[PDB]
Amino acid sequence: RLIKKAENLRYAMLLEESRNWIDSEEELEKRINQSLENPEAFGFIVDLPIAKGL
Amino acid sequence: AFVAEVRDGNVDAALAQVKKYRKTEGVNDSVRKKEYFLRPSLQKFRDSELTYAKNMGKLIHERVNWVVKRKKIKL
Amino acid sequence: PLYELLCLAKPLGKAEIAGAMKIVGQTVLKRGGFITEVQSYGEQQLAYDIRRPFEIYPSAHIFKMEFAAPTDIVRLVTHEMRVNENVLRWVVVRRPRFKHTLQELLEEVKAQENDDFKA
Amino acid sequence: QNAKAHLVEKFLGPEFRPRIKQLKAKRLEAVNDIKRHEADVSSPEVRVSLMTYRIRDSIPLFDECKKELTGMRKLEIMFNKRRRILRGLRKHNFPIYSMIINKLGMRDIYSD
Amino acid sequence: VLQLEGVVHILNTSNNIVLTLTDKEGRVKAWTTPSSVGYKNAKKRLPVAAETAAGELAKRALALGYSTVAVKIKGIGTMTQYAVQMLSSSGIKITQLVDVTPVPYGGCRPSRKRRV
Amino acid sequence: ITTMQWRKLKIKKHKLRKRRKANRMRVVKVR
Amino acid sequence: FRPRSTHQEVTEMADFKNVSFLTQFLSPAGRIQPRRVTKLTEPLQRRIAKSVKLARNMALMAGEARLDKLHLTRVRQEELHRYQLKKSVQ
Amino acid sequence: KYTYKFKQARAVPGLVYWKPRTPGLRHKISIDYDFLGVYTGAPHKDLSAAVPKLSGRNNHGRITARHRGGGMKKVLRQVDYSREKVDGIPGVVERVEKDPNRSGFLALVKYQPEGQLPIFKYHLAPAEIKAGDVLLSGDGAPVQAGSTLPLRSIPLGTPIHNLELTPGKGGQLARAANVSAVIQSKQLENAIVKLPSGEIRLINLDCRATVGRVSNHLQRMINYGKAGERRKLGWRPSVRGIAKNPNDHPHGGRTNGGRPSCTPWGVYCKGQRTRRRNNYTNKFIITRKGGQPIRKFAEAKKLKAR
RNA sequence: GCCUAAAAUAGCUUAAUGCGUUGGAGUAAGGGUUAAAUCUGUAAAAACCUUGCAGAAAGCCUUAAAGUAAAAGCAGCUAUUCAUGCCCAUAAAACAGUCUAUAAACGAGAGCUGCGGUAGCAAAACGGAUUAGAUACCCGUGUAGUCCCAGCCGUAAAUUAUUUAUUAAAUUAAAGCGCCUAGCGAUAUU
């Protein structure tokens, strides 16, 4: 019973993350342009947050 | 690549640093390995001899250290 | 699974960089995946210069992309990087599927029930 | 921006998973008819069925990769083990032996 | 004229010592070796031969106008100590010592061992 | 097996190998 | 006394991209230090070594000190100053 | 090198190992076209022509190419080595056929231009193209086997074949079975290309080539078991020089090889060079076969004269 | 969910080295020995700064192997396929054993056939020395081989006999086998 509740908890969190996911080319072009216009610093200066999953 | 700056013309001091870098950073070990080739079975025996010599030196100075600690010998 | 791509490209204009990034994105979308993160770090100076048959590159433009797709996407992305001549070097690394383990989720559920039980 | 539930379902589903994981999921579903109860994963009926399904899925695998000798040796070991399990069932419990043969379409050649 | 900065390359590989004088761009101006001074097959391994070669190179370096030099050493040997000291005592100022001995990351197979 | 036992076998193996090589390129093998 | 990172920090930041972080486990000549000096567990020792090796493949690190790249220390400090100023202004 | 153990093993797929029933079948090894899916029937009617055999005779009626004639009927196929006509239109492969006039395989491709009738063409089959595949050429095509692109859009390490020396004349360089060429570097207006023979040459960047190799990897495993097998192909026997009489060959006399080996016209044939020392094309050759620099070849007798 | 000196498959990185390699600068040696010489150069070498091409191998981590991969064996990076190992949570009312007469598979290095490749090292071979002789040890060149793919060969000083109980080991008593009966001596016959 608790495992089933845990599965539902994971599903709820992923829905919030999905708001910023891109699956259409129109969003892809906008994301690429924004990224190029606002460069970030690399690991030579500041430590970067390493991705752990979704 | 080790760079040793010479201060006040003390060339001997710079030479001492160069020797230290070679021993600490393993340059003498690479030269020894590449002088000639030994089979992996013969390289194993060579490593055993070197470690044995190191252990004997460690044992000898372990005895001396105990004498100094107990009898306060000024060597 | 979840993959991350790090690409070192020549320090060209924005339009050329955008084109290289768009090729990878469409490959992922076509196969049936989606993209989570797109970032760029600008031009960076490398530890040593990358040498081509008659060229030397002491710096490069670096960008990263994170995406989820079937296991067959790795070969498709590798092919695109090799074909494109504006890309100097690339690497693809797999990442963990989930941020939270099953044990961590169970502890959160148990804590919530204890609060309700106390209430 | 709105949430994309259809993307969450794909990620949680078997689509973005290695081939072996997808095959193993199908094997468990194929034994839903002969298992003793909803959580039986160790009865002799279930164990023999899973071994048989693994053999069938491995035949195409080794037709392409003919040099993976380690995998073949593991398969050969399981092949002999399943024979001795069926030999024991026939001698001691015929009714269970009959069901396994009928379900998997085997032949009664497991005597001594 | 005398405001010239140069580089001295010392190569020592267990049988001979080679000293080469170059500018800061890599162009060679002079070079010396124990055989060029008078020491031959078996006598080239003596510390005296290394000192004489170092002294001769210093004389040519001063004539060309190189008073300040940097020394780059390649290899492990005993002759480098004497050559460097002779250059310093000959009137040439040494500003830096650099070790550039290579280290293979794997590499090629060396020759067999001598069963002497 | 001891070193002495190895050496005793060594001589006989050498003699057999030498004879086989001689007969390798002969019409009628010497036996 | 020298700074030491916690094992929790290592597991969270042990990546080939964080060259600055990975520098703490390299000798002044640029070689990998043994586990008896780093004071790390076996799983953490392996991760650090692989991160350094991968960074070398991508030209983010050099296998040894290079004489032709001695100005990078100046470059990194100049970049660091600009980044701090930009963020402070923002 | 053929060995009798190779035929006994009978291992390589795609070959017909004829059982030694007769003296003429003991050493015979052929190709099994059915097992490979290669069509071995008549050629397309609109892309072929029947022609008489020449047997190595020119318009003066005299033999200029020796040891030819006496084979089977000859039919020729028209092959489009340059696909500039159909740049944009994609093509679908219908069949892979065998041609006795070449060592590779040909592919029959159908194009369907918009507003026109279907078009059929013959192409040199790439290594890994089968019936039903799609071939594309011109700008905007992927870098995959069977695609034809200019040298400006091909990676360095990708093997290529059917390369053009001139911009639009057609592919001429790499055609034989299981051969390819590679690009080493690209300069301002030329690319350095290594040919199948090991020669490094300069080729203009506007030339085109096909990605992949040629489509026959069993050419060197063939063994003709009979004299008559090559007679049917159109080859006639030849006689050794030392067997003739003095008035026929320089080796004619009773003694064997009284003088160094040479051609029937007296030219040394065990190392003498025949390329012109001052050939105009020396400006495009960097290294000749075997590693000889071009300057070494161009200036070799001038130094001896000096 | 993660890990892996496990296997198969496919991409990628270069410290050093070699050259009938490019350009600049420069001029007598380089290489080697107990001591010498053959050899490579002065018609422009080695050494120094640069250019091109190529093969093999994987510094520090790195240590046993503590993986034990069944044995043979196994650590440059990344990914796929597959098999293990770790944590956390589950599952079986009847089934699963030890050993091997006989039979099969896997199997270092060397060697054989075909195809591709050939830097370094190196049987054979050819020279220079040492010596009463040197047919060896030493020095200079150097082909097969070592490398890739597909086949053949099935041999090593190719680990401690296997299993149950006890045991840190050990020791004690049992279950199923293989081998030995003084040495010496065959290319016996099949």
Ligand SMILES: [K+]
């Ligand atoms: K003839």
Ligand SMILES: [K+]
């Ligand atoms: K004659």
Ligand SMILES: [K+]
């Ligand atoms: K073997």
Ligand SMILES: [K+]
């Ligand atoms: K060797």
Ligand SMILES: [Mg+2]
């Ligand atoms: Mg006659």
Ligand SMILES: [Mg+2]
């Ligand atoms: Mg062993």
